[model samples]
Target: ETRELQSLAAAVVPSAQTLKITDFSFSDFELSDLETALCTIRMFTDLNLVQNFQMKHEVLCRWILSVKKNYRKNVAYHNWRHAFNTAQCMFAALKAGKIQNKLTDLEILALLIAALSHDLDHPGVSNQFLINTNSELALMYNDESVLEHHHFDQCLMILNSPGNQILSGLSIEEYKTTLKIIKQAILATDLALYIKRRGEFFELIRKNQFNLEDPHEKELFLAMLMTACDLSAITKPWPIQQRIAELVATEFFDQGDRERKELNIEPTDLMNREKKNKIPSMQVGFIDAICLQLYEALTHVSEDCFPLLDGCRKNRQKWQALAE
Candidate 1:
């Protein structure tokens, strides 16, 4: 199994330029699953995760493949490609955005892992849907961040599985610390949590009191970064951004279909296919409500992150044009 996974990881060698570019479009290039896996391995190397964490090359390869496999192939928006894209955004934030300087090497590793596993085993439905439907996952997590908790559990399962223990080389203390960071980072991807905590983060940045050296401040920063990366589809070029928006809308519409057919309930505007025409306006609202301030705050964190905010601004204009 390890050998097969290693060979799979070795099958595609992305060009040096492709591996390094912060603004590269995955949708345009249409990377195969193996190519995405190989890019992930190269990302870890670029971020110094491989060397810094003392992870064996083959084990890392196996672990990447295992994590990719765990994402359900059937999901529309939350599949492996979205996970890879989220990780790519995290990589860009660390490298091009230069946020890595504020982070410990352990924190960097945990952030990357959290990005890749943030939506694992996702049913491509909202958390509210899970609760409304009384799904097992909702019940298990007590209807709070249900999918995020399940995603983290699935992450732990993959990590503990044989041949997929990429962090095996860590000391016990480091391992525990990494897991804690991973959990917080994953949970922070929950937008509900983001909305609940972003005011504190925004206020810190506003007051110029943000400090990554402080544990509380660092946790808030990391949580905000996770949301930034998770919603980064909005920060891509117009074509990529538009394509991803349609994909997300399709997924939401699917959930709406389920809600109507299975639960006999009315779906929200964002989820309703009948309301599809409202997508452009809804996207503009999404940008204003979520993307703009978040990216702007990230820019204040580091000027290198300005491209993300720029991309977001451009996309918002494009969306606003369509909305009008």
Candidate 2:
């Protein structure tokens, strides 16, 4: 219920042009990408890209946790900026597809905040870590594979403190509901379960089933879209999207290699999952499956927009041209 959680003093949205990070400022009362980030989030929320207040709480809590500065070094990409980017992309997905409703101002703020906060204190490792070590997260989560859940939980715990009453304005019931939305959105980020959940969502949409019967379920699917956006950005042009995947692949390879050297674990990344001693092969099948699944929804909503992806298909062989 906090309308302005973590105040973005200035630099409102769509301010003439994009606010690139290169010129970003963090000082109070100045133009800041942080402000731009918040405004972008506000845009998503206002436009109903996120859909509800509970979802907004999820976003706000995540945003605060990103700046904790306790996370490890060199994990540059998972910070607040990336969250802003993801929320922006989520908005695009909402618009590009069929996001059916509008969000309250508070809800929009929360969703944007959650997107930014989802990966705080990331150890540059995958969720599989819970299964391996006697680490705290493993103990707390009880061997759960859903690492993001714990990571996101830690982020939300921040608001529980007396000093961080971001949602202090809410009545107890509203507060609990907001927390529920945040918790559900965060826990549902388990990528291993994404396909199954996504399938259910698509089926619902195909049936034009509105869970207005359960508005929370309808909103939960929007949170899922944020994760999907992170993955689907790959379908973009090779120069733009491929570079991101390349960075992502490099990170996964680093983690994969670390697991091998430290735990004698086999790499589970797409590159090394199947073949040992060789770089993991690209899982065209998996990528195809994700794309195929996404394309179905996209095609129906964007009936005449198939041309965009059709062009991407024409460029498929471009990957084979890689020097790797």
Candidate 3:
């Protein structure tokens, strides 16, 4: 392996290390770095590994890098870089407390895989636009969780790819269960699903009933973690948060331009460059009404998730400043 790859391997927290995984960032690196980092993190676990396997870790790196290439769409945002960033956030949470131990090694792997694939093949267009245009994705998916379904399908394709069966070591039952969790976690990123599930989680927390040991609580926490990581860009430092907001606005306006030129339709307020003045306020609304709440819910389940909530609130204040 090359030096960078060696460094990547060293970055993972071996089973005996006291290091925290959240100390790393992927923003400054290329996709190859991210691919290496992700592979190393997955291999860092205490999961049993078969000896004398050629593809044990190297093949997994190749698998993720191949999947990362599929996210090369030139949308202003929602690219492979975003996927890597979200996966890093998920890694942060996974190392936060005893949560990883609480989850089976397979479950932990699935969540990380789902994070890396949650936005796979995103077109930088909203679902509403797909429905409006009667796009094939919308028609084929019946406009029901269309993008999320597509992402999940892409994830499966990569997992099932030749030489990309990173989970090959697992028994049939464990393999199936891992895929199920990955599917559920990726599908949970649909904004509509998050909206409904968010309330259920809030109710549980309100009643002081969120015990991670409970299967339902575990289910809810996993879904919320997906949501939190999906929006993790906003929970980054202020500069990064501002940059992501601008990138998102750029994509929204690009979609709006396409809608106007091709479909002869007026874009939604947030998507319309005509309403560019509202971007800051719109972002602030998202942070206050949704993003902050997602992180808050994360803290409810994992106290070590406080960093997520703190970063979110800190960024929220920055957006509010820009808006005001």
Count of clashing residue pairs in every prediction:
0, 10, 0
Candidate 3 Cα misplacement greater than 4 A, ranges: 1-21, 24-26, 29-55
lDDT of 2 by residue, 1-324 (tens): 243444442324443134332111111124454464455545444554345433344444344433344345565345444445555554544443334344444454455445555666676666665467567877777666456776566667666554455566566876676666666555555666676577777777689773634776646565555555445444555565555555566656667677788789777744253443232125344456665456456555445324335534533455434424
- lDDT tens string, model 1, 1-324? 656685865576565366553653335246667778778887888788888888877788888888888888877789888889999888888888888898998999999999999999999899999999888988998899999999999999999988789899898999999999999999999999999999999998889888787899999999999999999888888988878888898899999999999999789999999989999999999899988999999999999989889989999999899889
lDDT assessment of candidate 2? 0.52
Task: Write the number of the candidate with greater lDDT, choosing between 1 and 2.
Answer: 1
Q: Which has the higher TM-score value, candidate number 1 or candidate number 2? A: 1
* Residue lDDT tens for model 3, 1-324: 345435543454333123233532334243355544554455334332323222366556556666677785688788877777777677767775345656766677788788888888899888888888888888888899888888999999988887667778777898898888999999899878989888989888989987777877787788888888888878777777777878889999999999999899888888899989998788889888888877777787778878778888888787788789
Q: Candidate 3, 79: how far from true, in Å?
A: 0.9
State the C-alpha lDDT per candidate.
0.87, 0.52, 0.74
Q: Evaluate model 3: give its TM-score.
A: 0.86
Looking at model 3, the pairs that clash are none
Cα-based TM-score, every candidate:
0.96, 0.70, 0.86
> Model 2: which residue pairs collide?
45-108, 48-103, 56-110, 56-111, 59-113, 59-114, 62-117, 211-214, 271-280, 272-280
Models ranked on lDDT: 1, 3, 2
TM-score of 2: 0.70
Worst 10 residues of 1 by lDDT: 20-29
TM-score quality measure for candidate 1 = 0.96
Give the poorly placed runs of model 2, Cα more than 4 Å off. 1-73, 76-81, 94-109, 161-164, 210-213, 216-220, 269-283, 298-324
